[PDB]
Each structure stands twice: as structure tokens, then as C-alpha cells.
Design a protein around this ligand. Structure first.
Ligand SMILES: C=C1/C(=C\C=C2/CCC[C@]3(C)[C@@H]([C@H](C)CCCC(C)(C)O)CC[C@@H]23)C[C@@H](O)[C@H](OCCCO)[C@@H]1O
Length: 252
């Protein structure tokens, strides 16, 4: 019912987050030629054995994810209040939310035109088949695509998008967090900002917030499945060389 105006602080928070995102997400994907080249081996049959023996797309996707984790770290450090947390808690939050924020932020390159993550040209267009070539199974990819479509259909304003990523990162319910109360206070400040923004820009508003919060739950499920699959992938001899030091640590 009530639609209070965004406070000066809430406006500042939003401006800071938008700026942080603009500085950490290059919509032209101009750094992609710096990643190890994508290699797409003939695997129309989706052979697990072949995929694991080759992991042809792993070096490229691992570099993309590694690069993205660095951008997420940069974004996170700019979240108002994040610097007030101990270094220990910051690392805990980053490591636990990294893959989830990557899934969220990837929605910007995701296109429902052909259900792919299109980052410029055909060389940098990723479909289900490309992810299987990196060693993952449909048990993760299909739900991920479904998640991307559901998120896409929310038609989030960029303001809502960046607040959602911030809220995802600053979650007090992450195993290993030391000061959950402080983390929850920061998250509540962000959550209240998002709730207020939605009410201000949407008459619809109550439904949208709930749908956004549900996406955060969906991400926890995707996170778990990815972790399980990463474990399996790590068993493949020489896999470490196809990954990166940051990827190894974050998911190790
Ligand atoms: C990374 C990102 C992109 C796409 C994300 C994808 C497409 C390919 C497969 C991934 C990467 C999924 C798999 C399942 C994760 C696999 C990781 C592994 C191998 C370690 O297990 C998770 C998200 C999936 C492109 C662009 O929008 C951003 O790109 C950055 C440009 C702007 O900052 C974003 O940041």
C-alpha cells in the first residue's frame, strides 16, 4: 500500500551499486580475446567419457569464470558496508556467493532469442553444448537455463539487478560467517532499499520482490549442484592446468 520515497541514503546506495556494476561489467566483452581460446570438439552425442577426456571448453570457460570472479570481488568491495566486515567474513561471503553472482550477472549476456549467453560474436556464444564440453552435466545446465529465463522474464531494472547481486553477496546465512548480525544489518539495508525502490517504480511490487527473493533460493540449489559437479571435474587428471589458481581456491 504505502510507497515511501527513497531516502537520500538509499539513493546513494543505488548510485554506488550502479556505478560499481558499470565499472565491473563490460557489456562489450572486449577482454574475452585474452582468455584461452574456446575449443569445440565434435560431441553431438554428449559423451561424458569424451567430454572428460577432452574438456575442450574448460580452459576458456575457466578463464571467463576466473575473470568474472575478479570482477565480482571488485563489485563486492564497492557494496556500501562491505568494507565494514572483517577480512575473514568478506572472503567467506565472496567464496560462497561467487558462482551465484556469476549466474546472476550472466543474465545480462543471456538471450532468449536462442537460449544462449551471447558475448559478442559466434566464438563467444555459449550454449548448453559448450558447458557440457567443459565437463558439466545437464543436471546443472538445464536448471541454469531455466533460471536464466525466469530471471529474464522479471524484466528487472538495472537498479533491481545490482541490488539483487549485492543482497546475494551479503547473506548472513553462509556457513562460516563470524558476525552474522552485522552482515544481516547490511543486507537488511540493501533489502529495504530494494523493497522501497520496487514500490516506488512498481504500483506488482509485492509480487516482484517475492519473485526476486525466490531467485536467491534457486541460486543456493544451483550453487550446490555446481559444487558437486566441480568435485567430480577435479578428479580428472590434469584438470588443475585447465582451471586457474583463483578458481581452484574458490571452489576447492
Ligand atoms: C561469466 C559470465 C558469462 C556467462 C556465464 C555463463 C555461460 C557459460 C557457462 C557458465 C560459466 C556456467 C558454468 C556452469 C560454471 C562453470 C565453472 C567451472 C568450470 C569452474 O565449474 C555459470 C554461468 C555460465 C558472460 C558474461 O555475462 C559475464 O562475463 C564477464 C564480462 C563482464 O564482467 C558473466 O560474468
Amino acid at each position: 500500500s504505502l510507497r515511501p520515497k527513497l531516502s537520500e541514503e538509499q539513493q546513494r546506495i543505488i548510485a554506488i551499486l550502479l556505478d560499481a556494476h558499470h565499472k565491473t561489467y563490460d557489456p562489450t566483452y572486449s577482454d574475452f580475446c585474452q582468455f584461452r581460446p574456446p575449443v569445440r570438439v565434435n560431441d553431438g552425442g554428449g559423451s561424458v567419457t569424451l567430454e572428460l577426456s577432452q574438456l575442450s571448453m574448460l580452459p576458456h570457460l575457466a578463464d571467463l569464470v576466473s575473470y568474472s570472479i575478479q570482477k565480482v570481488i571488485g563489485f563486492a568491495k564497492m557494496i556500501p558496508g562491505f568494507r565494514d566486515l572483517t577480512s575473514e567474513d568478506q572472503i567467506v561471503l565472496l567464496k560462497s556467493s561467487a558462482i551465484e553472482v556469476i549466474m546472476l550477472r550472466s543474465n545480462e549476456s543471456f538471450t532468449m532469442d536462442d537460449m544462449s549467453w551471447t558475448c559478442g560474436n559466434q566464438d563467444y556464444k555459449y550454449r548448453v553444448s559448450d558447458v557440457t564440453k567443459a565437463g558439466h552435466s545437464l543436471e546443472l545446465i538445464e536448471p541454469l537455463i531455466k533460471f536464466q529465463v525466469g530471471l529474464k522474464k522479471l524484466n528487472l531494472h538495472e537498479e533491481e539487478h545490482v541490488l539483487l547481486m549485492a543482497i546475494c553477496i551479503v547473506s548472513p546465512d553462509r556457513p562460516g560467517v563470524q558476525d552474522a548480525a552485522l552482515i544481516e544489518a547490511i543486507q537488511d539495508r540493501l533489502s529495504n532499499t530494494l523493497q522501497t525502490y520496487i514500490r516506488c517504480r512498481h504500483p506488482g511490487s509485492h509480487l516482484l520482490y517475492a519473485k526476486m527473493i525466490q531467485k536467491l533460493a534457486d541460486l543456493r540449489s544451483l550453487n550446490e549442484e555446481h559444487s558437486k559437479q566441480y568435485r567430480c571435474l577435479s578428479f580428472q587428471p590434469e584438470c588443475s592446468m585447465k582451471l586457474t589458481p583463483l578458481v581452484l581456491e574458490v571452489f576447492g
